[PDB]
Design a protein around this nucleic acid. Sequence first.
DNA 1: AAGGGTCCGGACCCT
DNA 2: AAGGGTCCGGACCCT
Lengths: 367, 367
Amino acid sequence: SSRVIVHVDLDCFYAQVEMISNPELKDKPLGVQQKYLVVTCNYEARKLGVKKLMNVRDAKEKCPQLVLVNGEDLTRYREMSYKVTELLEEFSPVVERLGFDENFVDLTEMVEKRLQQLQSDELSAVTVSGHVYNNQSINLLDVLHIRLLVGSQIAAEMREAMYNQLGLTGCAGVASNKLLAKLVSGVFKPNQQTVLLPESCQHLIHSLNHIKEIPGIGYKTAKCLEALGINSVRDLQTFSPKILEKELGISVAQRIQKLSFGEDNSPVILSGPPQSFSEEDSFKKCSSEVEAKNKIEELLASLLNRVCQDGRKPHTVRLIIRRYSGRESRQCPIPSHVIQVMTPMVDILMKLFRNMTLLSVCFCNLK
Amino acid sequence: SSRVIVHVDLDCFYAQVEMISNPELKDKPLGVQQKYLVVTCNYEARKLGVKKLMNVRDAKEKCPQLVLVNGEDLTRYREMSYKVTELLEEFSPVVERLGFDENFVDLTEMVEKRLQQLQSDELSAVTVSGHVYNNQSINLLDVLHIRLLVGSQIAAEMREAMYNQLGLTGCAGVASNKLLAKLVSGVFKPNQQTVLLPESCQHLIHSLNHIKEIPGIGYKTAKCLEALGINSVRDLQTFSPKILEKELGISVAQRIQKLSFGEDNSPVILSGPPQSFSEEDSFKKCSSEVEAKNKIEELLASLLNRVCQDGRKPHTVRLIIRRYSGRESRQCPIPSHVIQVMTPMVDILMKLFRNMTLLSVCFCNLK
DNA sequence: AAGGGTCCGGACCCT
DNA sequence: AAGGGTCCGGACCCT
Ligand SMILES: [Ca+2]
Ligand SMILES: [Ca+2]
């Protein structure tokens, strides 16, 4: 499908929001601490040595100047996330969210309208905004190249708007599919954008050194592949489809092999309003007594403020537990009286607990 | 919630469609045969002795005049079903479908608009269309009674339209919830309608003799209840909520006990377009060889015509098997090339079969 | 960590 | 029979 897909990857999001919140934090190594880990850091801290998911103490030693603002409360990050998605939705309605820092948009229709409102007497001037992957030559005669070049311009527009309206810096990637767009978005990582012309897809797919770097292949699938002997993209591309279907399933095998060739027909989805609101707390086997009710109590109060703000209402509640040894869950439709609050809720949640390192409450079935 | 819900139950649907298809079949005992069973019969055959789900031969003996048109192809029944749902949707958009003979509609908004466009100087004339359950007295002073009486009139309008436009006879039931509406729709069964006023809900709930007659309680739940000793509605109403939650689950226990009191907050849903298209064939251990591919082949061709007609397209395929001994299933996303046909499809379906009295093919994930 | 999303196969219900 | 629908808990993915 001749599609133009854009991937928007914001740089150090949690940190960028914290730096905007306290100007002083600007031009200073900043790390976002979650429990015992530094989940995100500014480029300055990365430069001095701080890395993602690093022990906080090791970091403050490698970077004694590391100011560490806590980020276990994701409320302000979530607010800016939806502000970014909303700006992008004004450009085109269908925006898919991946986490809070990434967004996908299909610019195909927008590209076509701009290309029709144009005259071929100005085609020699359709110019690229940003880097072209593999310094590939542009052919202003190939329609595909022109469409992707228009997407490059819309991406530059989206990025300038995100800075001018939300003060946020980010990277962009324009391609024919979501996989290629996400993979090209980080070729130039600090506040830059890259477009992948069709004749350079194989260079990007073979640029990867681990199959886990392919979006869609995680720990389990990769372990299965490594055991079959597949450690390269070419290995997955050249492996027998039949054996892979037999050991992984027809669905996973066909999709993952297509990804090895840079093929993804996945439609860009409209994520729209959130479908779940959850809150959790991590602990060191600190829950060995039904006193875990106290933890569930705190989690409920916090999540309650969030569901109050949305306006839509929850109809199913879920308790997710993490034992030390893999997360089990038990859900129940919320009684209507409660839908119209803590004591009834804790009673239901405790019954779910009794039927079943981490405790989580989730409000789903939102209407 | 002060709601007005209507249940539309068409009389002997399959048979009514067959009688419309062959006028001659009118005023003659008619039975719809499916394999070895008579799934539906006209009232004339019911009068002579024919019953639902009866051996065809036993029926043709009790009623030697029974003309039996085959109804294993549900295409014409399905077409009339959506014609009925569409007529009802013109009255109000939210229409829920239960099978092909039943529809639920929320008339609350319609009732309110008509009641506002009315003057209290004409309230003494709001009259009921159809029977009132338990010959309950109408109180034109209770707003609830007035709202349900308006629903009675809209139901009579819907029924007259179904006869005048589709030549179909049916029964209707107006109440505050879907359970009470479905339960009151059949008090007067031949082409009649009944309204349940609020002070008569307990009479209807206690009118039932088996808890399985309660919509929502099937074989499994009823067996569990019978083992706990619950065989009456009063038994379920008076049983300990706690023990029921322990043996059946918090969700089922709370909902089924509310149903025992005639309580159902279930929202009337807009069923809208179909979400699945399936075809199956029942056989006497006639599939003991991979030759079952031949059966899957026929099923596919048939279902293909149906998916061609819808206009929306399938994205996931499912193979459902019934062994003699409980239906297992294996699904796979359909390759995009096929989505844009028999040989590729049978190959995927055979792989699903090899991974796994009845064989069924289902086209779901429709977009 | 601290969230958040689809897919899937079964159980159960209904006609 | 011959269809058709939600609920659910887990696996797996992503940030
Ligand atoms: Ca980064
Ligand atoms: Ca009947």
